[PDB]
């Protein structure tokens, strides 16, 4: 049957800028780079093994991510301990990224942040 996620492909405004951001913030490791007919991409993997492909589409506007547009509302990553969240907050702050400090909720702790294109991301330590 269906097991899980093979990989998530995210559209970014500037490949290079996003590659650096994901590398610095989430330890994303670029494996290969490439060029499509109307796009440029970078396939990378996060600690834990999750595959994340960043894709820049030709002649894209300046337009940022918008939760109200069909597609991604937000992507939530699972972490192993509170330390992971502390480290993320430290990296986010140092990069001057937008983020709301870890909040404790009924089902766990959530750290909500935004990438270089305002894409809504979260890191959660579940109970």
């Amino acid at each position: 049957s269906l097991s899980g996620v093979s990989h998530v492909s995210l559209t970014v405004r500037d490949l290079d800028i996003s590659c650096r951001w994901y590398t610095e913030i989430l330890d994303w490791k670029e494996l290969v780079r490439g060029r499509g007919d109307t796009t440029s991409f970078a396939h990378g993997v996060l600690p834990g093994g999750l595959s994340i492909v960043l894709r820049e589409h030709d002649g894209g506007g300046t337009d940022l991510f918008d939760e109200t547009r069909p597609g991604l509302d937000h992507l939530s990553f699972s972490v192993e301990s509170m330390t992971d969240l502390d480290v993320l907050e430290e990296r986010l702050a140092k990069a001057g990224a937008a983020f709301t400090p870890t909040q404790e909720l009924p089902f766990g702790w959530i750290l909500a942040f935004r990438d270089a294109d305002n894409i809504a991301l979260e890191a959660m330590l579940g109970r």
Copy 2:
């Protein structure tokens, strides 16, 4: 350390339509639906454990899924056997959904399809180290 995807929250034009679509196509099972500040949501889980939250924004439904816009380009699921792909194609066809026949590639087989909001999805089966091409 980061350990993968906790869950994926998708923005959809019509919550009810999407719930039925995901239930019927991917055996998504709704665990609870509620109301947020400016949204309606339904949290469900897929076979294999992946959590998917469907979310309808009160002020949404005017723009279309557009992979050229920041956010999701496409979401690819891992499947265990060819039969999983065969079943998906059958369901997609029966439902009159948008999809292309499963394609055989060097490193595996991929079934590309769209949900009710045209969001780009894929089902993937690996080749190397398996015997799916030996039957």
